[PDB]
Structure 1
Amino acid sequence: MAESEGLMPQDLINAKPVAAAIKEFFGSSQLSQFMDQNNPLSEITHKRR
């Protein structure tokens, strides 16, 4: 319902949901987990998992 003159593209889009989704996936997903750094081989076998 907003007008082209009444609203600007920067004021229409809310970027909060995409940032929240990216943060949630990168911090709380099952596949996101702390790297095994006790061995250099542990890192390689974790990233190739």
Structure 2
Amino acid sequence: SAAVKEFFGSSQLSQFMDQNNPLSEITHKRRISALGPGGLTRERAGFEV
């Protein structure tokens, strides 16, 4: 429970829903991020990505 609550509670991939518009919900659920654990960071990468 500590690991799964640590993931859903604190990660770069798990964030507050932008909820001020139906479009904003439906495009925050449809988002393809390349950041987070197991992915590149803004400092290190990069131009081709």
Deviations 1:6-46 (A, max 9, x none): xxxxxxxxxxxxx1000000000110000000100000000
Structure 2 regions of 5+ residues with no counterpart?
32-49
Larger gyration radius, structure 1 or structure 2: 1
Identity of aligned residues (%): 94
1:37 aligns with 2:23: no
Root-mean-square deviation (CA, aligned residues, Å) is 0.4
Structure 1 distance, partners of 2:11, 2:18, is 17
Instruction: Name the structure, 1 or 2, with higher relative contact order (CA <8 Å, separation 6+).
Output: 2
1:27 aligns with 2:9: yes
Q: TM-score, normalised by structure 1?
A: 0.61
Structure 1 distance, partners of 2:9, 2:2, is 10
Matched residue count:
31
1:46 aligns with 2:44: no
Identify the structure with the greater helix proportion.
Answer: 1
